[PDB]
RNA sequence: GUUAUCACGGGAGACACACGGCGGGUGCUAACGUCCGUC
RNA sequence: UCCUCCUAAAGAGUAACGGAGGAGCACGAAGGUUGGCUAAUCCUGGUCGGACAUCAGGAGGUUAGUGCAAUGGCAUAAGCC
RNA sequence: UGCCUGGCGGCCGUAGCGCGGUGGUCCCACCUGACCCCAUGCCGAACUCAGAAGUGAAACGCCGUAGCGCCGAUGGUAGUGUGGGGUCUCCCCAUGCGAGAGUAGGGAACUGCCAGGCA
């Protein structure tokens, strides 16, 4: 199975971040749609979240899943976090490979004004 | 020589930062909150508070936690 | 592609008609092909392993990968980490063309053609047999043949039963047992 | 067809069990159904004489306790390791 | 419960314990032989 | 001299000339980081194969391995690339 | 807000394993090559790009099956702290703590937030 392997791979950083106990931004990716959220240190509350399936952020995107869509989602997440006052969250790519849409959205969030 | 083994500090007792709770030969107990595992598989506190024992996990492994007072 | 189009056009139709399936992809779908070489005499000499790997790469579209020792036994005097053989994992156009070229000429022309076995299955429908006299293949020419060698051929498919393998053999027309 | 007698149980614990075994008696329990299980007191010699019968393994016991008739069946009989004494019986209101 | 508890300063004595009770090891699940933890 | 299990009695310590054993080693990788994989054994097919070179598939799920004698642990791996 | 789907936590065999059914509304999953993002101990092996061309199929969400498996009383039993006795290798007396195992019972779990869909 692929989802089980991905979850187990992400479990490393997921458990490692518990000791730090700081809010962390995570992104789940799929060729169809992309979801993103900012989990609180407790691991049960999210200060903000978004999904490409939502028209409110997919209106300007030719489709929910694409590099431009991922970049726009990352920029929107970063802007919402900055206006909410997330206070320097950490990053977690949900056990993905940091070369494609995840890299694009991470770069977008970093240039939005973040320092992670 | 008889190597010293056993639980140095029990649950419900106060411990300070850097205090060892149990110097175990292996890993019969696992650190939880405010507890760290040294290279010698020894659990040491990282803050000041009361110690507590718990059982959880798929194998019902034992965890040692610390709650600040 | 060249064979995949025909496979989808005719094989899938007959399979669905005979098995009264409902889901479009319920018909078996090939996953990959495996061409392995497990002679085991690589301990005596290492050059034969390299020559056979080169021959496999030439006949196929990709180079084989070497396989190291799995478990050591004192009886056969085999160590750990010592390569013995190699396998080619055919997927995509390479596997399609290789299988087409095989079924076209190679399989019909073989000494003592008693017929392939339709019951020798692993248990979930994966057909994995072994064939000797590698000279049967057209690529292996007398200018490069070194010694009468054998290979293991498997067709890994998404099916999980022997009925699907039997249906695939019927689609391939299964000359005779 | 088989006569039985019982006594109300008002004590509990290993001390009570020792008291009964010293007084030549032992307790038993009845459990099953929605009704709460209950402990009852029986003597020793009379109970042994009753158990001497070979039909007990399939007969339905008619317990008479507090002027009430209850149909039960014995499932477990904790017997002393080697001595011929009984110390606990289990019944189900079948 | 007379602070019966802990801390520093000076003065000590011993530095060969036996018997009995409780749970054990060695001993041959021969023991009331023998050695341990505690009163 | 050091180290491992009992004795050593559900906290720790705990002895006899009590019952049982290993060592004076060892790295410029056998350490660290980061990206990944994941055990012996049996069954199906198998010119070499005798059941016991390895090979394609199934069960197994740490009885494997975890450099040394042994003890506690190691699957998130402390096992391997 | 009634129901379905995916993610983020708690709990860690009441959530576990076998069998049957159902599912494309959203979501999830299968697909071509890749000289381009990423790279292979060869392989696009793992992960990425164009989405539905087509489907609910390995797998995956849910329901039933108490079948395998798991949790589990009251009470009883073995044991044990204190004072004494006996025929002192051990047992009993007054009293406190109480097994394991087994039975009844439990249950196909549950819970907080976000996101999408049929209404």
Author numbering:
A (entry chain O): 2 to 117
B (entry chain W): 13 to 81
C (entry chain F): 1 to 177
D (entry chain V): 1 to 94
Sentences reproduced from the published study:
Separation of cellular extracts derived from cells exposed to Api137 in a sucrose gradient reveals elevated levels of partially assembled and not fully matured precursors of the 50S subunit (pre-50S). High-resolution structures obtained by cryogenic electron microscopy demonstrate that a large proportion of pre-50S states are missing up to five proteins (uL22, bL32, uL29, bL23, and uL16) and have misfolded helices in 23S rRNA domain IV.
Based on these structural distinctions, we categorized the 11 Api137 specific states into four groups representing different stages of maturation, five of which lacked cryo-EM density for the CP, while six had docked the 5S rRNA, with the CP accordingly formed. Importantly, the absence of uL22 was consistently observed in most identified precursors (states: 1-8), implying a systematic effect of Api137 on ribosome assembly.
